Design a protein around this ligand. Structure first.
Ligand SMILES: [Zn+2]
Ligand SMILES: [Zn+2]
Lengths: 108, 99, 82, 76, 94, 85, 148, 99, 83, 109, 93
DNA sequence: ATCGGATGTATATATCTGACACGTGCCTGGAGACTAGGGAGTAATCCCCTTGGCGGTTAAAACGCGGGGGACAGCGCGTACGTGCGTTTAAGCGGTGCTAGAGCTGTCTACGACCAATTGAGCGGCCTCGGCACCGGGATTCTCGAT
DNA sequence: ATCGAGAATCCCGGTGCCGAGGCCGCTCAATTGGTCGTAGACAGCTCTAGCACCGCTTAAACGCACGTACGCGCTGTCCCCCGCGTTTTAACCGCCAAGGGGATTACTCCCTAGTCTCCAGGCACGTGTCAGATATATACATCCGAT
């Protein structure tokens, strides 16, 4: 990358790089912090947030709404297997539950 | 002559309605009063921010919903439809909350 | 002073929570067991919440204390900070 | 009194100035002779940068003295 | 006056605009996303710190973060996250 | 109808499609180009700029990236073009 | 390999479809290194402005964005003195679908009207944003003294 | 004329016996070979310290013992004395290992 | 030197003895396949983290400490083997 | 105290104060470490170790053995209540399991 | 070779103080070492998190006391905090 | 309700061996004295918000009654699993050979910590307009007693 | 197999509101430059044990036969939640009012990291010895068929 430019846009990220570097340095994690670790961690965070927001926005557009509410976030998180496994022990406030009824309970 | 629904055909309607919306299910003031009672049992002269009470209510609703889901699954496993306290005790013991 | 307030969690509230859970038929002794387990859960969470809010020499239980206690117990909560 | 200026682009230029002339005047003459902007120059003599406000006589620059110019880019 | 508070609001909004150009986001959703980002950051940083402390080192390079990402995330998410991290580091170097 | 050979070639490398990937944005390009882009490009479709990360994960789990219909049609129409590689 | 054939096709396309107000070609035998010239737009203070620029091509294209530099030292509110170019197409909105003709026409358009939202040199950015006249005739004085 | 125990007493005797014993109930070589197979499936050309194999075996035995305990408790809850696979995946679902 | 169908090494009497230790009287006839599947899944889960740990340190021999900390990460801490 | 003997003996403990202090300082836990925290932590660790050792020794004596084996440790941990809750996730090597059978399994009279 | 620190002699001394005659085997030594390490790590981590939450930068005795109260159950927590308070009071004078 | 086999389990005694408790060299880590200065304790002040109270109205809770569907108990069956015995299989143990790789050591070079100046990315406060909440009417669709 | 009446739910159109997004001003931390002490990357050596092989026991796995007991389906009984209607109660909203403590600021002060020096506590190594596992032979608790 070319020198003398803001760190966030040097590698095409949108998440901050200086803030992440400061958080790693002052967060009592290790005595010394490498140069590429903040970039790597910011990239990971940006990718995860982008995926979550994409799924939530798709659900919101499906639900005939142009604004994202916590219900859409809950649907997006609990609908995909990987994201559900990752966020297994986390309860989203005002998210409700996925609609399901056991097959035996259905009337005959 | 009056229109009466078959026993069990409107409980499904309630299940469908409550599984779609996300409001609170426990009345706010009784829960707040109970929380204040427990707190003053622990330590006297305590004041509660409304956000903390709302967070506690959210956590309680989530935990109770999960417990009832497991209880229903156990009751279905028992070749029944009714949930009984033995199902709740079994679910709690398997989840390790009582051992 | 408050006493006999566990009755505040009435029968319809338990029925509504169970209906959201996905159950169709409810016995008659579920309510007492549910009240007992809910009281236990509140005691367990409030103990850690009060410990947190006391360690800081404060006197008001704020949402940060509640979310920290929930995270410690293994029930991380999203929506009130953190 | 003449000075040697060398930049990062490898271009060597000569300037006619006096010790009493200010560094601002030196940069103005540099702009006049080559187009180098006066406000974006970092000239170093004896390992120290020459501040614009004071003159050459304050830095004790004689004949044959060589100034090391480092081009300064702002922003990115 | 009030002390300044620092959060992940504007960056999340920018990412959302880059993904969906015609979708707004409420305040509660912003708080939820901020909490999620903070939680994932804490998890990855703590795991990387522990793993660095394992091999008797004192520097958190890109290797520790890469290994922590490989450990915490499930299969496909870990693979795409490690790909994204390698891409970002490579673009930062040159 | 059948698209001609001039239209079917990959829009990135000007080559015949090589078990392409059918994107949700209805864009088709040869698999080596797609793998290079997902490995080191912006992870977005070059044409209408819409990221496909979640769909990429879903199809990569099931190994459904390749579109066998395009392979069959292009190999039955043009064996020589594919065989020259 | 693929890159060489891609560059050959790009050269053929730009030869058979010449662009406007610009021209380009291989400076030497190596196909990677590239040179071009551009003419100042008439609806601008760049009258009588001819500018020589160089393009360096990486090992893969259009897989990766090529490097662009201005050999002629020309003033611009978003261009440094050494030729550094701040283009959002160049490093942020770069896509493999983009061709060399596209990037040259985009940079020509940027020279037609620069974007001050993300300035490269803030002092001349605020000089431009203060009032038009002084910026206009100062840009004119460089474009006459330097280009001609 | 031959003497044989009623069906059920020998099982109870084995339950009373093995609950006192502490050694490994799985043969060492088959478990080592299976662990090596999985490892070579993941990455090629690795070598295992014997302590690592022993620790893996101990963890597996403890996990299986716990799973069978919970499965048998579910079987008793379901008015039965025989464990069936449905009990196994019910225990796994309640424990949250597969959700 | 690949290996085939080695999961059969966990023979029927071994699973029977494990169940007897767990406190089970009567055993059905289909528990064994489910037990083998569960054991294979658990081995894959632990071995993935163990191999990652032993691979980060640029080593070639996985040690007991890596297995111990992989188990600790999974939540099933182990005592008596170091750490 | 008179401040004459070693730090561990000065506080009347057996667990090390210097080793705990070094572990706290070098463990990357916080920038600063107080001068009383290692003593308090050593006291807590010593008390817990004493409780578990006492229970294990009592169990071994009830089993007519003069040495503590891992089975005795498992019996001591499981049989008690508070320790069982504290160590409800750990796995003890060569520990076995507490012996019990459900009442339904026992044969009818 | 290389030195490897352990709590072996200290736990052995505590055992001798409690039971004057009973012995302890190597496997039990390893188990006790692992338990001590785990408890120390848990308490230290909780104390560090408590220090970081309150915008502090040091780990004092009261933070360790709060961590002990949070981790161990009620009766054990009360006994442990009493023992630690006695130890620190004896040490400070 | 036991009685006599008959099996397995529990109990007393020699023995010998290998793992545990103890003695010893020593060296690397723990203890003691002196400084600086920054983190923390303490006093003072502000104003946010938390507790407290009064009135309305009404959605929600409480109580009672007919009843029908599900929980629960008893019977019969036949098939799957417990139990025992002869047979084939490979685990377990000893002994040896070999080297790939774990672990320790010396060099030094480049990645990273620290301090000043500085200015632009990011935060607190304001304002507005459109997306969403709400109400009324009508169209659509499960549902059940009766055929 | 169905038709139809009554009830619950979805679409659509119109109206009104409040909070989300953009803008402005500003204070502070991220950037750039330069310097300097050291972390570990690398090459080299040593030497441990993990792997492979061989051979000899004999313990555990296996297949088969027999018997029995319980999982499952069926049938019947009864009783207790459910759905609905009527009545009582306090939840929720809006309103006001006080003051208590969370939050901020300024000041001072003493606790501890850093440095150096010195020395002894615990670790690696080695050795003697007895606790318990093993083998062997008795004594008793318990199960099963049958009166
Ligand atoms: Zn292509
Ligand atoms: Zn597209």
């Amino acid at each position: 990358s070319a020198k003398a430019c803001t760190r966030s846009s040097r590698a095409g990220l949108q998440f901050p790089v200086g803030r992440v570097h400061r958080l790693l340095r002052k967060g009592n994690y290790s005595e010394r912090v490498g140069a590429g670790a903040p970039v790597y961690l910011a990239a990971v965070l940006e990718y995860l947030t982008a995926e979550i927001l994409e799924l939530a926005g798709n659900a919101a557009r499906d639900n005939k709404k142009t604004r994202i509410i916590p219900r859409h976030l809950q649907l997006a998180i609990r609908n995909d297997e990987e994201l559900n496994k990752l966020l297994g022990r986390v309860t989203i406030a005002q998210g409700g539950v996925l609609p399901n009824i056991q097959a035996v309970l259905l009337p005959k | 002559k009056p229109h009466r629904y078959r026993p069990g055909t409107v409980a499904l309607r309630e299940i469908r309605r409550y599984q779609k919306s996300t409001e609170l299910l426990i009345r706010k003031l009784p829960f707040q009063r109970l929380v204040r009672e427990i707190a003053q049992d622990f330590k006297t002269d305590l004041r509660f921010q409304s956000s903390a009470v709302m967070a506690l209510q959210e956590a309680c609703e989530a935990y109770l919903v999960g417990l009832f889901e497991d209880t229903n699954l156990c009751a279905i496993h028992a070749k029944r439809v009714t949930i009984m306290p033995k199902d709740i005790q079994l679910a709690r013991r398997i989840r390790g909350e009582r051992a | 002073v408050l006493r006999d307030n566990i009755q505040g969690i009435t029968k319809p509230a338990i029925r509504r929570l169970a209906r959201r859970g996905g159950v169709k038929r409810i016995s008659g002794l579920i309510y007492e067991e549910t009240r007992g387990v809910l009281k236990v859960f509140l005691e367990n969470v409030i103990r850690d919440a009060v410990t947190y809010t006391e360690h800081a020499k404060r006197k008001t239980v704020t949402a940060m204390d509640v979310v920290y206690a929930l995270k410690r117990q293994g029930r991380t909560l999203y929506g009130f900070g953190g | 009194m003449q000075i040697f200026v060398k930049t990062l682009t490898g271009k060597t230029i000569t300037l006619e100035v006096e010790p009493s002339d200010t560094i601002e005047n030196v940069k103005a003459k540099i702009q006049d002779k080559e187009g180098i902007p006066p406000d974006q120059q970092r000239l170093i003599f004896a390992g120290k940068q020459l501040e614009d406000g004071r003159t050459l006589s304050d830095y004790n620059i004689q004949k044959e003295s060589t100034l090391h110019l480092v081009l300064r880019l702002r922003g990115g | 006056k009030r002390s300044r508070k620092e959060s992940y609001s504007i960056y999340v909004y920018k990412v959302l605009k880059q993904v969906h150009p015609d979708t707004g986001i409420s305040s509660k959703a912003m708080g939820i996303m901020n909490s999620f980002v903070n939680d994932i950051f804490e998890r990855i940083a703590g795991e990387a710190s522990r793993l660095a402390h394992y091999n008797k080192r004192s520097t958190i390079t890109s290797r520790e973060i890469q290994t922590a990402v490989r450990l915490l995330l499930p299969g496909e998410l870990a693979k795409h996250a490690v790909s994204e991290g390698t891409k970002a580091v490579t673009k930062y170097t040159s | 109808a059948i698209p001609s050979l001039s239209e079917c070639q990959c829009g990135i490398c000007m080559e015949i499609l090589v078990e392409p990937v059918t994107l949700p944005c209805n864009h088709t390009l040869c698999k080596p180009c797609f793998q290079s882009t997902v490995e080191k490009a912006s992870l977005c479709c070059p044409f209408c700029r819409r990221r496909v990360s979640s769909w990429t994960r879903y199809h990569t789990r099931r190994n459904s990236l390749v579109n066998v219909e395009l392979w069959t049609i292009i190999q039955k129409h043009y064996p020589r073009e594919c065989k020259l590689r | 390999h693929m890159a060489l054939k891609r560059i050959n096709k790009e050269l053929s396309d730009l030869a058979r479809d010449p662009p406007a107000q610009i021209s380009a070609g291989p400076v030497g035998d190596d196909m990677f290194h590239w040179q071009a010239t551009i003419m100042g737009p008439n609806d601008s203070p760049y009258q009588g402005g001819v500018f020589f620029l160089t393009i360096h091509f990486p090992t893969d294209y259009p897989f990766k964005p090529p490097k662009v530099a201005f050999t002629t030292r020309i003033y611009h509110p978003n261009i440094n003195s050494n030729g550094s170019i701040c283009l959002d197409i160049l490093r942020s909105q770069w896509s493999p679908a983009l061709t060399i003709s596209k990037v040259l026409l985009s940079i020509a358009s940027l020279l037609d009207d620069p974007n001050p939202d993300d300035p490269k040199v803030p002092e001349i950015a605020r000089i431009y944003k203060t009032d038009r006249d002084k910026y206009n005739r100062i840009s004119r004085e460089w474009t006459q003294k330097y280009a001609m």
